[model samples]
Target: GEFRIVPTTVALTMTLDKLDLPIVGKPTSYKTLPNRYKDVPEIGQPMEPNVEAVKKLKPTHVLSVSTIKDEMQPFYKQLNMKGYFYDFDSLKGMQKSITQLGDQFNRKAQAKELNDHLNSVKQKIENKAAKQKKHPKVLILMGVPGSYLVATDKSYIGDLVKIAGGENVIKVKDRQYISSNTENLLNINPDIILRLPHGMPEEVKKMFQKEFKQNDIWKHFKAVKNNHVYDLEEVPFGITANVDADKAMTQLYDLFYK
Candidate 1:
């Protein structure tokens, strides 16, 4: 019944809070974690957390995610830290991850409650979206640390948009990310363009505007001039899906329908 835990990413840390688990350490990237993690020991960036900070915790489990499994799995082994990587690619996958986390962390009841709500939310929105005659063609611009990428249907945000009844313009099969082809995106001419910021969100947003503004090319798009461009809030519309998917879905549903 005893476990010392460290969350390598905010998404994992937030999920643990929802599952009613305690975290001994959290990444220092974001100052605002859930209240429980506000005072937790600060590890470094989720990309490469501070080894010294993590070692001090001596956690039974250090939590990462499938999003970075390839990079962090090797790194965790190098330091001999036991780790659990949660899958977070899609909303359905996120629920699966939650159920597994619940089993592992003894939070089955808590996880069941979250999953039930998620299911209900999904049921309602999918039904509502199906009522619409037109599904908005949507382009997802993911602002990472340095530049941006195009998000395909396989990405968490893309998956959410699909659930919310938006048509992803990328039209690629099962690929999460692809290099942005700005000119090709112009040809596609989406009805709405959603820009999402991640990895140093504040810095990325500043750069995000520069990329859009300086390239006057953006002005030519129907999504840009028609005022359908949206800068999605990074927390709920996060780099990975979290319990906030219900909220995120509702936002997208409205954005798509209205």
Candidate 2:
């Protein structure tokens, strides 16, 4: 494959990561990367960076989004880079972002094709869902570990899930991020538990198991036993809109029906 370069920091990185896009290299200043549910291509065997190795490639162009660190700006600028920023906060943002990215990458045709594909998938799911008599009550488990956040109807994930066929259980809650306790979980007892992926270390998982063992109240939730809990790829900052929401929802549809 003929390779081009995309600067590897932004909210969109996770989506690209899920699609298994190749990232030839990354800037040295990055201390952390996005939490991803799928594997993507990385440079060399291990994908670990050696800054000197990247400069040697002499990529044709470099890509960046709004998230680029200030310190790295001089480096990219010196290299004569190309950058893209997508708000992903609304429908218009999505279209504009796609168009802009298409123009920059010389992938306008490919972008349109991808957009069409996504729309078709979303429509198919919507039609199928509408035919059904009832929709499942869904609870999206947003932050993990230190804080558990619930997605209200307005959040991108919440809105996309509803569009794809599930009803957000938190629609009536009247808040964007909800804090909950054991009592709240039992009371909500959602028909579906969509867990946004959290990178939980093995040791922490064991700790949680031990801590929850003393409480009988912990085991009462439907999701805990029936195994309806699902881990989802976290949305990258680049994906403010729900472009990949259809893809995620389709996976859920298959899981629920099959």
Candidate 3:
């Protein structure tokens, strides 16, 4: 096995953590670090890669998401280090990324076993969804102080909503997320709304709360009227995805089916 390092993103770190590999250097600084790895040293933020700090760690390999890989590549190349870029846009993509890493670290057996478990979980969710009498129209939103963004079918959460037997209301051609306003929301009129409030500052959270609480337009939405609007925490919802698909599936199943 070779020494490996991951950025601070929850998805990347959790994937390696599940593989039982130790991250040689510090992770990027992010508040989304799970409680289990709260003590892991943080070198820098992914948005601002600390090349010197990463080089000092002397890691054989650095794992990063595709979004930042191009920027980091030159640095890793200069340092004579190997960099792996993982694109986790879908379930299959995630599995491929994990398998690629597993093969890189000589942990193919473990990776296969984990993938098997994930497949089984997916099967379970699919089975439950098949038995459902109806699939509700779901709208996944990321809430900020004064605005809402809609998750399209291409996003991770949007894909999960589909797997959970919910019809995602937004149907964009290619974008993962789209900036949404009151008019758009009113037009789509989803049956269920899953809100992610994780990592928001108190002031922003309060503003969001006020908007939802006082707005008459929201009151008219079917999700709000039927009490189907739910808030999701960062750990299992916002943060955990490819690495914790089983947990995600179970959570969505209970929310959508049970």
Put down candidate 1 lDDT per residue, 127-240, tens digits, no spaces. Answer: 999998999998998998899988887789998999999888888855677888732765686899999998778888998789988987798888888898899988689877
lDDT per model vs. reference: 0.86, 0.54, 0.72
Report residue 157 deviation for candidate 1 (angstroms). 0.7
TM-score of 2: 0.58
TM-score of each candidate structure, all chains considered together: 0.93, 0.58, 0.84
* Top-TM-score structure, candidate number: 1
Q: Which stretches of candidate 1 lie over 4 Å from their true place?
A: none
In candidate 2, clashing pairs total 6
**Model 2, span 114-223: residue lDDT tens:** 66776687678778878877777788766545645666664556656676678776655444356755226565757777756333434334444553466676467676
**Which RMSD does model 1 reach against the true structure?**
1.9
Candidate with better TM-score, 1 vs 2: 1
